[PDB]
């Protein structure tokens, strides 16, 4: 029983739905200041009726916006885009559902023993997204994979929840369950662990 | 021992045997390099242009490496692609029956 | 980690930026981005006077990277030869044991 | 104590001589029919006085030419270029000093359990040349390395003598002892075995 935890495009969602038992549509939300919570809840409710289970992805540089959206206590899974060591940090502290790709755009993993400790305590999952790898060049590929490896070593050590995902913004970025398990495995996951990143852990979250 | 990976190919357009044969050695060459490629021993077997399904061979130890190499693929001759592995088997006999009978070979 | 001290023989003297780049090219073609990610190569320093340098790797993947550099042939249209002078667990021992002769 | 077993260029010979204790100059000899044994012995004698130890490399398609040259019993190490399967086969049968790169230009190792048995019996060494790798493209690199691996597995099993070498036809193809041991090691040789391919085995031959 496999679960695609993050897809961000109607076309991608339907394709994943061939190969997955559960597909979570994700609303990408770029942010500088607070959003109209009327318009936002309305938009979120439509997606519940359209796609069933829904997630809200925050991409921002203001950490207070995490500790604001979170408070509104919306009827959707709360994701946050990684990259900004502030946002990474705040995301874990705020008890968010998952932090997506803490290494995004960085020259280092953007994740340490401490953040792992907090993530484990707060029950915050870590998203191992494929989409950046697809879009990166060989150098970048190698860099990202290194970051993913360190993150996994930590994630395994502190019993931190996690999943693997396409984070597909188009159908071309979509991959099947076993196709995604390759990423986990080659990052250092044993096969049973890589299966849990699609089965046991995502089940628990939704 | 070798292992055989059956895969489906989703693309903007149907591809030909020559293109996939080539594309298998490109995914492995960038992902694993020529040394890693030499250790994994990938080998294109056949591709069914009708159903856009194929088979590729590898050492048993380096399956997940090659599965990763193909998922990592994006583009073949200026046309976006998706490789989906339908399954793995120790023989083309079991592979064709178990996974490729549907397409059908 | 482990540290590899190497000499660079070429048509031309070569600068820091070129070798830094060239280390990630040998590894990328030899080991690929996955193998590269497992080996974790990392350029440390290059001495342009003496054409000697240092590169870092995981201890398990030394011979891989040594092979990767021997496999190297051309840097920016000018033929090259990499020669490994030795290996060590620390830059302290490395500089003393193998690079004292050049600079350093 | 390291030995470069095969270099084919004055410029290459002198460079190797920086990094090696013994360097064998090698006279490449392309062949269709028998050579003038007057001119050939003369040319070989000059090289003995110039480079000390000398080797004669046969590149041909007529296996009888191996059996003929060998019989002349010249004052030089007898190498033979691999590739043809006839030539590979004959070279081992004839008791030559070494067969160089049986996989050369092939789509397979050009070497099996049988040839290994004979090589071991007849005391015929196998040359693991780097030069083809340098000149090949990534695809070719990978192919050659596969062939080298199979050959090594056999070569190890039947206690077949062997060495690693540059086979340098110019100074740019030259590599140091440890640089060459990398090839052996990554082909599957343990470090002590890879050292013997430059030390113990080449000593025995010269």
Curated annotation (Swiss-Prot), chains A, D:
Superkingdom in the source lineage: Archaea
Presence of the UniProt keyword Transferase in the record: no
Enzyme class, spelled out: hydrolase
Gene Ontology CC annotations of this record: cytoplasm; ribonuclease P complex
Name of the molecule in the record: Ribonuclease P protein component 3
InterPro entries in the cross-refs: Pol/histidinol_Pase-like, RNase_P_comp-3_arc, RNase_P_p30
EC code: 3.1.26.5
GO biological process: tRNA 5'-leader removal
Record-stated family: Belongs to the eukaryotic/archaeal RNase P protein component 3 family.
UniProtKB keywords: Cytoplasm, Endonuclease, Hydrolase, Nuclease, tRNA processing
A Pfam cross-reference name: RNase_P_p30
Catalyzed reactions: Endonucleolytic cleavage of RNA, removing 5'-extranucleotides from tRNA precursor
Assembly, per entry: Consists of a catalytic RNA component and at least 4-5 protein subunits.
Function: Part of ribonuclease P, a protein complex that generates mature tRNA molecules by cleaving their 5'-ends.
Protein location: Cytoplasm
Main location, first listed in the record: cytoplasm
Gene designation per UniProt: rnp3
Curated annotation (Swiss-Prot), chain B:
GO biological process entries: tRNA 5'-leader removal
Keyword entries, A-Z: Cytoplasm, Endonuclease, Hydrolase, Nuclease, tRNA processing
Main location: cytoplasm
A cellular-component GO term for this protein: cytoplasm
GO MF annotation, one: ribonuclease P activity
InterPro entries: Pop5/Rpp14/Rnp2-like, Rnp2-like_sf, Rnp2_archaea
Keyword Hydrolase: yes
Entry keyword Membrane: no
HAMAP family: RNase_P_2
Subunit structure of this chain's protein: Consists of a catalytic RNA component and at least 4-5 protein subunits.
Protein name: Ribonuclease P protein component 2
Organism (species): Thermococcus kodakarensis (strain ATCC BAA-918 / JCM 12380 / KOD1) (Pyrococcus kodakaraensis (strain KOD1))
Originating gene: rnp2
